[PDB]
Every structure is written in C-alpha cells, then in structure tokens.
Design a protein around this ligand. Structure first.
Ligand SMILES: Cc1cn([C@H]2C[C@H](O)[C@@H](COP(=O)(O)NP(=O)(O)OP(=O)(O)O)O2)c(=O)[nH]c1=O
Ligand SMILES: [Mg+2]
Ligand SMILES: [Mg+2]
Ligand code: NA
Ligand code: NA
Length: 326
DNA sequence: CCGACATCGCATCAGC
DNA sequence: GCTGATGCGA
DNA sequence: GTCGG
C-alpha cells in the first residue's frame, strides 16, 4: 500500500525506535517500535483511531495512545521535545557513523564532541573502524545502482577465480534478490578444501588480490572467516565512483547453501522462514538446518547440497530469490 | 507480575 | 602474557 | 513496548 496512507504514523514510530536504540539504549523497545511500524505499513486502510491500530499484532496500549495524539494534533509532544534536545539529538546523529554505536556516541557527546566536525578534530579518540566510517560518512549512506553492483560482481568473480579456480563465490543480499539498488555487497566464499573439519589464508588470499587490483581500498575488520571493508570501481573523464561497503565470508563447503540462504535474506523473509522452521520441528541458522527433538532440543545437522533441500525439509516449495522480500 | 525478545565474527576493553 | 566481557554491525 | 506464561 501507498506510504501516504499511514506514513505519518510509521515515520513517527521509526523515529521513536531510533531514539530507543541510540539514546535510551533499549534495544527491545527499538524492535517493538519497528515491529509496529512494519505491521502498520502493510495495513491497507487509512487508520482513523488508535483503537483500530491496536487490533494489529505488535500494536499495544501505549502505541495506540500515541496514534491518537498524532491523529488529533499532527504531532507527538515527547518526540517534538527530544528532537529539540541538543544532547539526545546529537547522540542519535553520531550513531550514523559506522563504528559509533549508542555507547560511543554517548561518551563523545558527554565530552562535548557532537558533530562530524568535532569528530574530525578528534581523530585520536576514534578507533580504526570509526575513522573509516567518518571518512566515508556520505558515501556509506548512498545506495548502489544495480548496474554498478554488476560491475562490482564482475571484478570479484574474476579475481577470485584468478587466485584459485576451485573457489566458489556468490554475491547474496538484496543484489541476489534482483533489487534495483543495494546498500552494500555481501560475498559468500567457499573452497573444496574447507569444510566442517579441516588455511586461514583462504580468505586472506582473496582479500589481498582484490587489494592488488585496487578494488578494495580499506579494511574495517578481518579475521579468518569474515572480512569487512571498503571498495571502489575504477574511474571512467568521468568523476570517480563512491566508496562502497563490502563483506566477504569464508564458509565451510557443507554449510554453503544454508549460508547462501541466510545471507540472501530478506531479514523479514528469514524471520518468517525461521518462524515456520518451528512449524514442524525444525530450526535454521546460517550454518545448518536441524530437527527439533520431542522436547525441543535440536539434533544433528541434516545434509544440504542446495537451497532446494532446505525447502524440502520444512515442506515449502522453492521460492526464487526475487520473491524473498517477505 | 514479570521474563523473553535472534545471533554471530571481530576489535577492543576489563582484569587476573 | 593471557581469558573473558562488552560494543558493534549485519 | 508488546506479548504471554
Ligand atoms: C541487518 C541484518 C541482516 N541479516 C541478514 C539478512 C539480510 O538479507 C542479509 C544481509 O544483510 P544486509 O546487507 O543489511 N541486507 P540486504 O543485502 O538484504 O539489503 P541492502 O541492499 O544491503 O540494504 O543478512 C541478519 O541476519 N541480521 C541483521 O540484523
Ligand atoms: Mg546488503
Ligand atoms: Mg550487508
Ligand atoms: Na495488538
Ligand atoms: Na554507528
């Protein structure tokens, strides 16, 4: 349904969600508000009262009261107030820097560091991740057109095969769902020699090669199985491209398709597919699918050699990635 | 009344 | 030195 | 904040 229908309400709830996570440090209120915003966004009617909204799962007494005030006044007294509040609004904003969470944002503001300009004057007080997040603040909030994603995929697949032709690399996330644009790039990686019981260099080799051809420009974090970094397409006369976020995960061969499924998403799709994993005694994480015991204890991971099989367990017929927005 | 609310890899801190 | 706890992003 | 044991 159109955003115009209840966009005022869902915007209100989303904003309330952010202040709970970032300022109050209340992650479960954050999720509570997001759940309510999500169920209202789908509601195919213009809400006329808080009582009407309360019928929806996730909308309770308090949010009903808030909707009634919003409907009556076009605003929320509490939200207007915290908006004007220099301390809280500065804390909330600083968390938009990748690496600065609710705790670090609080500490910065506590000592008078409230803006991007303040952060730029105080590099000594930032860790490696936070410096990169600051350096590319604007770029990291930009979206990536599918055309650039395809160009980015071309490079990753080419360099990965160049290192070792037995590698298998899959770009997942919103890209795999065929989305017209993405927020970042999620790469899943595997190799015939790495399974449930087996170098740390398997991931390193790839990262290093992508650095060699000057695709990967910065590193946020890098372990034996998980890389988080920054990349950039080569210049065109044309201006240069924005720097983008890219993750690369090395996953055991015998867990690849659970991984591919999990990190393809969507969030809301996985949340739904997991809920019905329960439906008839299955549990699914990013590694395995397991049967639940007679009293709810998961047993042995089952064999999986395709996304298909994971569907052949909870008894749901295959959904193409393009249909997994929900 | 009151506990659950998703989970995991990596960087960094708290402390022995 | 080290192990364990916490912050963080996805 | 919501839900339910
Ligand atoms: C944010 C998030 C994502 N995921 C999973 C589902 C996502 O589909 C997948 C990748 O995360 P993402 O890159 O933030 N989401 P996306 O790739 O579908 O969409 P976008 O274009 O990156 O915004 O990882 C979680 O399991 N827990 C999370 O908190
Ligand atoms: Mg993504
Ligand atoms: Mg991502
Ligand atoms: Na309700
Ligand atoms: Na942040």
């Amino acid at each position: 349904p159109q955003e115009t229908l209840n966009g005022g309400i869902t915007d209100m709830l989303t904003e309330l969600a952010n202040f709970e996570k970032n300022v109050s440090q209340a992650i479960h209120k954050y999720n509570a508000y997001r759940k309510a915003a999500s169920v209202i966004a789908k509601y195919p009617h213009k809400i006329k009262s808080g009582a009407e909204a309360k019928k929806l799962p996730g909308v309770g007494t308090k949010i009903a009261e808030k909707i009634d005030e919003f409907l009556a006044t076009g605003k929320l007294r509490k939200l207007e107030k915290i908006r004007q509040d220099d301390t809280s609004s500065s804390i909330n904003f600083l968390t938009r820097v990748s690496g600065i969470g609710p705790s670090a944002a609080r500490k910065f503001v506590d000592e008078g560091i409230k803006t991007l300009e303040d952060l730029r004057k105080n590099e000594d007080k930032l860790n490696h991740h936070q410096r990169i997040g600051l350096k590319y603040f604007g770029d990291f909030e930009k979206r990536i057109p599918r055309e650039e994603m395809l160009q980015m995929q071309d490079i990753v697949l080419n360099e990965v095969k160049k290192v070792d032709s037995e590698y298998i690399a899959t770009v997942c996330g919103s890209f795999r769902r065929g989305a017209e644009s993405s927020g970042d790039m999620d790469v899943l990686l595997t190799h015939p020699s790495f399974t449930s019981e087996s170098q740390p260099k398997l991931l390193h080799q790839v990262v290093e090669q992508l650095q060699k051809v000057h695709f990967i420009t910065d590193t946020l974090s890098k372990g034996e199985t998980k890389f988080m970094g920054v990349c950039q397409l080569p210049s065109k006369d044309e201006k240069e491209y924005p720097h983008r976020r890219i993750d690369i995960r090395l996953i055991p061969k015998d867990q690849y398709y659970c991984g591919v499924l999990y990190f393809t998403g969507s969030d809301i799709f996985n949340k739904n597919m997991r809920a019905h994993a329960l439906e008839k005694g299955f549990t699914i994480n990013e590694y395995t699918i397991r049967p639940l015991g007679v009293t709810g204890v998961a047993g042995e991971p089952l064999p999986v050699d395709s996304e298909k099989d994971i569907f052949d367990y909870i008894q749901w017929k295959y959904r193409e990635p393009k249909d997994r927005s929900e």
